[PDB]
Structure formats: C-alpha cells, structure tokens
Ligand binder design. Structure first.
Ligand SMILES: */C=C\C1=C(C)C(=O)N/C1=C\C1=NC(=C\c2[nH]c(/C=C3\NC(=O)C(C=C)=C3C)c(C)c2CCC(=O)O)/C(CCC(=O)O)=C1C
Ligand SMILES: */C=C\C1=C(C)C(=O)N/C1=C\C1=NC(=C\c2[nH]c(/C=C3\NC(=O)C(C=C)=C3C)c(C)c2CCC(=O)O)/C(CCC(=O)O)=C1C
Lengths: 151, 152
C-alpha cells in the first residue's frame, strides 16, 4: 500500500545519494515519465547548495513524440560539453535553463516500458565521462528497474 | 588520493548494504571479502532486531579454499528458503547454525574475472521463500558493487 511505496522511495533515493557521492557528480536525478511522456524529476541529490530541479515538470517534445522508443535497447546520452555538442537548440535551451554543462542520461525500464531517466549533470565545466561510469550508471538503472517492477 | 578512493568505495558499499537490508527486510545482509587463499572476512554488515552481528568474523570455508570459488565464476549461487530442508555438508550446516541462519541467498561479487567476495542475505527469525526478483536484485547489486570495486 503506502508502506510498499515508502520502501521503494527510500531505496531509489538512497541509490541516487549513493551514486552521486561515488561518482562525484554535481547533481544526479531520476526523471519519471507520465503516460504522455511528459515527466517530473522525482529523486535528486545535488551537492553544495547548487540549483535543485526536484519536482520540475518537463514536456520534452523528443520523448513525447517518440514515447522513448529509441531508449529501449541500451541506448543513452553522454556529452562531455553541451557547448560543443551539435544539440538541437530547443534541447540546449532546456539544459542551459537547468545549468547543465556535461550530462549522462541512461534509461530506466519497467519491464519492456521506458519508465524514466537516470541523469548525471555537471553544472560548470566539461567532464570526459569514462566507459566505466556510463556502465555503472546503466547497471544502477537495472537495479532501480528491478525494484520498480514490484509496484 | 589512496585514502579518499578507499573511503568513497567504503561509503558506497556500506550504503548499499544498509539500505538493501531494509528494502528486502532481511535480518542480516553481509559482504564477505576473500583473501588470496580464499579464506575471507565479513567486512560490511547490516543486521536488525537484536540479531547477533558477525561483522569482522574470519571464515576458512574449505569449499571456497579448495575450489578458489571457480564454480561461483560459472553461474553457481545459493538460494535456500529453509536450510532444515536442504542437503548440506554438516560442516557448512554447523557454520550456518552457529550464526542462527534459517534461510540464505549468497551471490558472487566479481572484480574483473576474479571472485572478489560474496553478497549474502540471512533470515534468522523464520524460513523465507525467496522470489526470483529478489535473487535477481541481489545479483544485480553485486554487479554494481563489482564495477565500483574494479576502480581501485
Ligand atoms: C519541444 C522542444 C523541447 C522542450 C520544451 C524540451 O524540454 N526538450 C525539447 C526538445 C528536444 N529534446 C531532445 C533530446 C533529449 N531530451 C532529453 C531529456 C532529458 N535529459 C535529462 O537529463 C532530463 C532530466 C533529468 C530530461 C528530461 C534527453 C536525454 C535527450 C537526448 C535524446 C537523444 O538524442 O538521445 C531533442 C533532440 C532530439 C534528437 O537529437 O533527435 C529535442 C529537439
Ligand atoms: C571446511 C569445513 C567448513 C568450514 C570451516 C566452513 O566455514 N565451511 C565449511 C565447508 C563447506 N562450505 C560449503 C559451501 C559454502 N560455503 C559458503 C560460505 C558462506 N556463506 C555465507 O553466507 C558466508 C558469510 C556471510 C560464507 C563465508 C557458501 C555460500 C556455500 C555454498 C556453496 C554452494 O553450494 O553454492 C560446502 C559445500 C557443501 C555444502 O554446500 O553444503 C562445504 C563442505
């Protein structure tokens, strides 16, 4: 009931806190999709008094049009410097509004469905993400997806 | 920093053990780290409800010392709902009984191709019918621990 949900919430939030300190990333969050693939930042660990985006609602028109279909088979984003990247203007603008300079975003699956994104943000300088860090983030997303599949 | 790399790995493994024990409602959750001779020590533990702690216990398990955990590198793991119903060596049954174990899951932690340790869940109050997703959850947490351990 509400007990199940409190238990999942605490586990997922602990993973976010865990991974943010271990990876030493400025901000780590979990973005959960609504039915229409709008979504909300529902867990967040941000260091040192920096910009919190917890409970921000986002209508990302890439996810809302694709329903995340491209994110179902190990696909992901890892950008060392969003200034350099050949990003869509509208996506660059979203990232800029939330102070992102470097990002890794991996999908969270509930069964065969895209449930959310697990996203690491640097807020000031570029970051050359390592293969192991991307694998760590993906494998923590698997952990989360198994726990989420129980409610 | 050799001091801070070890400290950050310690904080991460201790956080996983503490919160996974509460999430699965396990009586005792352990990380057993192997020495070069495949003796080992319990180096992280979350225990609740006034159950005996085995943190820092040294174990010379003669199965792991004789096999060097090779079977645990080729898909062996242990998931027993009630050790009273299982076929065990009396030596291994004595180990579990000493520490009040009634139900157990034990999965490998790898560092590259080497068996680094075991992630073990003990039920002490009662037998427990482990669900497929709980065994998968423990295996996948052991994967995440392995990736972190591989960095130092
Ligand atoms: C309709 C314009 C528009 C608004 C408004 C908006 O919020 N986004 C947006 C357009 C595009 N988004 C594109 C890609 C994209 N969005 C995300 C979303 C997030 N990353 C996070 O960390 C996070 C949180 C936390 C969110 C909500 C991600 C990960 C991507 C990259 C998708 C891949 O390209 O992999 C995008 C470009 C689409 C493309 O390149 O094909 C546009 C136009
Ligand atoms: C040399 C006699 C002897 C001593 C002493 C001892 O500690 N064990 C032991 C004999 C055997 N152990 C056997 C299998 C086995 N050991 C472990 C070890 C642990 N489980 C934990 O939870 C934990 C901590 C915490 C430790 C150190 C495990 C997981 C196994 C099972 C191996 C599988 O079957 O998968 C064993 C084999 C016979 C049997 O399994 O009963 C003997 C003889």
């Amino acid at each position: 009931a509400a007990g199940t949900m409190a238990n999942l919430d605490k586990m997922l939030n602990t993973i976010v806190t865990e991974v943010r300190q271990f990876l030493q990333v400025d901000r780590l969050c979990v973005f959960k999709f609504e039915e229409d693939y709008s979504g909300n930042i529902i867990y967040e660990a941000v260091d040192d008094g920096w910009l919190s985006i917890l409970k921000t609602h986002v209508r990302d028109c890439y996810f809302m049009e694709t329903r995340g279909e491209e994110y179902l088979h190990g696909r992901y984003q890892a950008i060392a410097d969003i200034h350099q990247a050949n990003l869509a203007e509208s996506y660059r603008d979203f990232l800029t509004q939330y102070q992102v300079r470097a990002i890794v975003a991996v999908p969270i699956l509930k069964g065969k469905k895209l449930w959310g994104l697990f996203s690491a943000h640097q807020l000031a300088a570029p970051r050359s993400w390592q293969a192991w860090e991307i694998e760590f983030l993906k494998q923590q997303a698997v952990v989360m997806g198994i726990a989420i599949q129980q409610s």
